[PDB]
């Protein structure tokens, strides 16, 4: 009884201070369905994965504010099983500089 997590994280807009992104439902995912679709950000160049959400992401679609202006972020999406278990972060989403929306 293995489990699967969720497709890799593609940012659908990205906002100088907002990245949107969705992902893809897991296949498998053993004999669970998942309840949360959490998902890290990294402040580059000198990050570390901080699980940004925190309103519970119950559909695979979900925008991880907090970020700043003139620096690129990262995105995975981590998470959890029905039994509970921590399903590995998802590929994480491009880096963008999350300033281009103010300039170009």
Do not use: M, Q
């Not at 593609?10 to 053993?30: C, D, F, M, Q, S």
């Not at 995975?76 to 998802?90: E, F, L, Q, Y």
Request: proline fraction near 10%; glycine fraction near 6%.
């Amino acid at each position: 009884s293995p489990i699967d997590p969720p497709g890799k994280p593609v940012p659908l807009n990205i906002t100088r201070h907002t990245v949107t992104l969705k992902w893809a439902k897991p296949e498998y995912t053993g004999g669970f369905k998942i309840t949360s679709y959490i998902v890290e950000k990294r402040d580059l160049p000198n990050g570390r994965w901080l699980k940004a959400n925190f309103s519970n992401i119950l559909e695979n679609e979900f925008t991880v504010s907090g970020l700043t202006e003139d620096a690129a972020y990262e995105f995975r999406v981590i998470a959890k099983n029905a039994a509970g278990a921590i399903s590995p972060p998802s590929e994480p989403s491009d880096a963008i500089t999350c300033r281009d929306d103010v300039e170009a």
